[PDB]
Amino acid sequence: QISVRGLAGVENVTELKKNFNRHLHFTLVKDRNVATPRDYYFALAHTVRDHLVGRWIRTQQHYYEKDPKRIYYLSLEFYMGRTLQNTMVNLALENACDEATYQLGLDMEELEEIEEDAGLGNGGLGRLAACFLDSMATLGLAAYGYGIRYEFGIFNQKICGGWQMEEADDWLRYGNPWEKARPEFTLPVHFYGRVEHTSQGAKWVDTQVVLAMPYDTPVPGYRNNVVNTMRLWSAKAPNDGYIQAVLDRNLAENISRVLYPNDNFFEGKELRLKQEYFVVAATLQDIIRRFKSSTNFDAFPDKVAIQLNDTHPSLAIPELMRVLVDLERLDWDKAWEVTVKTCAYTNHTVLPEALERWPVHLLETLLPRHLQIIYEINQRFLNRVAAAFPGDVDRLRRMSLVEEGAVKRINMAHLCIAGSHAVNGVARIHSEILKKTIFKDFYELEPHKFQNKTNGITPRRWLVLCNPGLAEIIAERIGEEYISDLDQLRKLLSYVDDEAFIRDVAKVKQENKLKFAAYLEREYKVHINPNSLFDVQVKRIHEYKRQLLNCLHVITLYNRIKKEPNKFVVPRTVMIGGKAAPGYHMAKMIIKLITAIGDVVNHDPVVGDRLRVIFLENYRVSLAEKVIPAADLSEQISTAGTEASGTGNMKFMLNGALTIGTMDGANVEMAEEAGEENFFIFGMRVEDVDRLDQRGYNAQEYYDRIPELRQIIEQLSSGFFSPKQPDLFKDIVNMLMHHDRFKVFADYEEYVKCQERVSALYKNPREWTRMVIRNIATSGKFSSDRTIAQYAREIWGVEPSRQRLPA
């Protein structure tokens, strides 16, 4: 149908059809009369997967012959989503399969909806890992993603009475056709035990063994026949009264059972630490095994790069030391040199309560040898600090890996900076904040380590896959090359005054909204006006992201309509979606608030279809792929200085929404690229927030000067939104007035006024769409291909490559 989806040749369609029917028969053990749509999905999945394996096998063969430097991306989170459509897109099979399935009397889009999300992540950090794998494959780097194969990913969110309920994400129930188990590459991981000292050095003994079993998942590059690997570890008990012994195997295997759903607040849970060492221990043995079969570890940094996705795999540093010192018998100073040259650390975390600070007593019991190595690293590091800043005893305690207090803690961020040759933030403003405030001491010691690598998203998933309409009309003007070189989108600037393009861009948006409005009714029984402005905020629920600020605006719009019912206002559908961490009470209250507002606003006949407030249930990658193309307004309204980068922001920009947001994270670079006039900026900058802290933030002040705000607080306090439970939202009002770290009231006025200007622009469709084109045309910088190319050149020391491997 559309040209970016590839050719549908007679030969290929014929071949896909018999391979489909073969798998239905031999692999699924069904015939057409008993097969369900799930069976049809699996047959299609197995058919598409057959096209990968040849490429997968010769890609790994290729890396053995040529022996290039290998990139290892260590993360506890890989938020992959669905794999079927992505694989088809990257192999140029999308039309052929659509034609093939159509000729068997099936709708492919219906079969794609049956595939479970691989939700092995929480949000931004996990999804960045997925975009990176796609981009690394596309740029021909010999790159492996390493992580944990959780049996249960992020929980499925269900709303019940406006409250979030969590149920288990049993994503492997029906099987995963994409993974290949490799039980033959199983490796021991050690826990507990104690340290024995001998003449021939230290020895870790009396350990409990857990087995790490790898599962390989293919990662296809975009039309280059490169297929990289993602290797995920699964926990297995070794095989050495009787009944209970066998049942107790579960304790060892619990290590890979479930993803920790907490992305706001650090908790020193033993099981979480086991997960972190597990991934690190098995991965490093795998790395070394591959290096040895290419004794001279001088070359190790020329053949290996290890990227740490935050501090979650920080133990890679002392583990590498342990192996090099205890098992390989290198002297300390030489092992340390190899380690620093090998490792690099990316920070994603601003807020102090999110930083990993492990209690020493935990490391003592579980990883006694790693504690010793950490103490030794700290001592040699602080000696360098003393020598460079003699007398500065304050600097010593601040820079120490060991934090003293009631309970001693290891600061894993300090460990990472010390043992890595490079540390980077994920947006320019974030990288500056790291140098100016939280790692200032470390920056003064080793200024050369600190870099910036502004985040990006993959245009394959986040344009071609989720928005074929938009991808096609762009292709008609400028061709196909933009898909792996997103800077080419700039050529769309010369079409900003083209009447036909303006009409087509606006039509694609209108189609996407119509399709999404129908998804809402069929799957969730809610009706919305498709001619309203689609105002969307989707992301994990945290106070710093300020979903509450959105709520305040929503209530303001409602109150103005009730005050002057017969005045014209731009109709809006306001959609808010996202998961709250299970133990985060305030986040759970905010979700309840949003549904409570919906209960009042959506059933007021004076309002009509001029305002709707919908909470998007179970926000996840596959939902983002649907709602993002349908959005008009992207809400990126975090308190300045709190959102390290953001990545959702970039998804919306690439898909034809305008952004209302603060000068935070990548927003700054987004406005810079598009021009500030094509961006709805508002609120305090970083410097303003700092000025407010010195004086002291008094919320009452804003309550006293702003009557519209006073009315909203009084409605919340007195039960306007909770008639049966008048004091339901007392914690929210109380936090907003006395304990608001994120200064919601301080931005309220500028926010509400900026929102009026959005509505004004939306009243003139032509000028809205022209501003949209200017955003889409300048979104090129935010491709993960650019990001990875900078990591490659400036951190890993490998050159990218767009060239095809033989098919």
Residues of this chain that interact with ligand 26Y (CB under 6 A) are 122-125, 128, 262-263, 266, 348-349, 354, 356, 426, 455, 643-647, 665
**Residue 32 touching its own copies (CB under 8 A):** no
115 binds, among ligand 26Y, its own copies, none (CB under 5 to 8 A by kind): none
682 annotated to a ligand binding site = no
- Residue 606 DSSP SS3: coil
Q: Check whether 64 is labelled as a binding-site residue.
A: yes
CA distance 471 to 463: 6
Q: Is 61 exposed, middle or buried (0-12, 13-18, 19+ CB in 10 A)?
A: exposed
User: Among 169-177, 194-202, 280-288, 304-312, which window interacts with its own copies (CB under 8 A)?
Assistant: 169-177
Write down the least CB distance from residue 244 to its own copies, Å: 10
Amino acid in position 657 = A
Does residue 540 have an active-site annotation? Answer: yes
Q: Does 545 participate in catalysis according to the annotation?
A: yes
770 annotated active-site: no
Beta carbon nearer to ligand 26Y, 269 or 507 = 269
How many Å apart are CA 520 and CA 624, to the nearest integer?
A: 14
- DSSP labels, 328-390: T---HHHHHHHHHHHEEEE----SGGGS-EEEHHHHHHH-HHHHHHHHHHHHHHHHHHHHHST
Q: How far apart (Å, rounded) are the C-alpha atoms in residues 379 and 401?
A: 9
Work out which of 20, 41, 79, 152 binds its own copies, going by CB under 8 A.
152
Residue closer to ligand 26Y by CB (options 283, 784) is 784
| Token pair for 699 | 């919320």
State yes or no: residue 518 binds its own copies (CB under 8 A): no
Would you say 294 is a known binding-site residue? yes
Q: Note if 454 is an active site residue.
A: no
Binding-site size, its own copies (CB under 8 A): 48
CB atoms inside a 10 Å sphere around CB 716? 22
746 close to 549: Cβ distance less than 8 angstroms: no
Shortest CB 53 distance to its own copies, Å: 5
Q: 291 among the known binding-site residues?
A: yes
Which part of the chain contacts its own copies (CB under 8 A), choosing from 83-91, 175-183, 303-311, 584-592? 175-183
User: Does 18 help bind its own copies (rule: CB under 8 A)?
Assistant: no
Q: Is 113 in the site for its own copies (CB under 8 A)?
A: no
Question: Does the protein bind its own copies through residue 38 (CB under 8 A)?
Answer: yes
Are the CB atoms for 650 and 624 separated by under 8 Å?
Answer: no
Among 198, 200, 247, 295, binds its own copies (CB under 8 A): 247
The number of residues in the chain equals: 807
Contact 235, 256 (CB under 8 A): yes
* Binding at 645: pick from ligand 26Y, its own copies, none (beta carbon under 5-8 Å per type): ligand 26Y
- Does the footprint of its own copies cover residue 66 (CB under 8 A)? no
Q: Tell me the β-bridge partners of 358.
A: 410
CA within 13 Å, CB half, 19? 17
582 near its own copies (CB under 8 A): yes
Q: Kindly state the smallest distance separating residue 477's Cβ from its own copies, in Å.
A: 41
Residue 289 known to bind ligand: yes
- CA 50, 53, 59 angle in degrees (round to 5)? 155
Tell me the three state secondary structure of residue 119.
Answer: strand
651, 743, 774, 781: the active-site residue: 651
| Segment interacting with its own copies (CB under 8 A) among 161-169, 492-500, 503-511, 556-564 | 161-169
For residue 309, give Cα distances in angstroms to 203, 645, 773: 30, 14, 34
Rg (CA), the chain: 27
How far is the C-alpha of 150 from the C-alpha of 232, rounded, in Å? 9
**Which residue number places its CB atom closest to ligand 26Y?**
124
Helix count and strand count (H, E) for the chain: 33, 23
Q: Which helix (H) or strand (E) holds 237?
A: none
CB of 169 to ligand 26Y, least distance (A): 17
Question: Which token pair is 352?
Answer: 């102090």
685 binds, among ligand 26Y, its own copies, none (CB under 5 to 8 A by kind): none
- C-beta closer to its own copies: residue 275 or 622: 275
271 contributes a contact to its own copies by CB under 8 A = yes
Q: Which residues pair with 608 in a beta bridge?
A: none
- Residue 125 interface partner, choices its own copies, ligand 26Y, none, CB cut-off 5-8 Å depending on type: ligand 26Y
φ and ψ at 320, to 5 degrees? Answer: -65, -45
327 near its own copies (CB under 8 A): no
Catalytic-labelled residue, pool 357, 540, 542, 579: 540
Q: Which of the listed partners (ligand 26Y, its own copies, none) does 170 bind, with a CB threshold of 5 to 8 Å by partner kind?
A: its own copies
Q: CB–CB of 385/297 below 8 Å? A: no
Our finding on whether 269 is near its own copies (CB under 8 A) is: yes
**Catalytic annotation present for 639:** no
Residue number, 125 or 506, with CB nearest to ligand 26Y: 125
243 forms part of the interface with its own copies (CB under 8 A): yes
Alpha carbon of residue 765 to chain centroid: 33
As given in the structure block, the two tokens for residue 261 are 């759903």
Residue placing its CB nearer to ligand 26Y in the complex, 101 or 645: 645
515 among the known binding-site residues? no
Which residues, in sequence order, are bridge partners of residue 208? 191
Nearest partner of 415 among 278, 274, 272, 316, judged by Cα: 316
Scanning 535-617, the segments in alpha helix (DSSP H) are 547-563, 585-601
Q: Binding residue for its own copies (CB under 8 A) from 9, 175, 608, 765?
A: 175
Q: Is 408 a catalytic site residue?
A: no
148: closest CA among 269, 313, 304, 263? 313
Would you list which residues are annotated within the binding site for AMP? 31, 64, 289-294
* Residues with a known catalytic role: 348, 539-540, 545, 647, 651
Binding site residues, its own copies, CB under 8 A = 25-26, 29-31, 36, 38, 50, 53-54, 56-57, 61, 152, 155-156, 166-168, 170, 173-175, 180-181, 183-184, 216, 236, 239-243, 245-247, 249-250, 254, 257-258, 260-261, 269, 271, 582-583
Would you list which residues are annotated within the binding site? 31, 64, 289-294
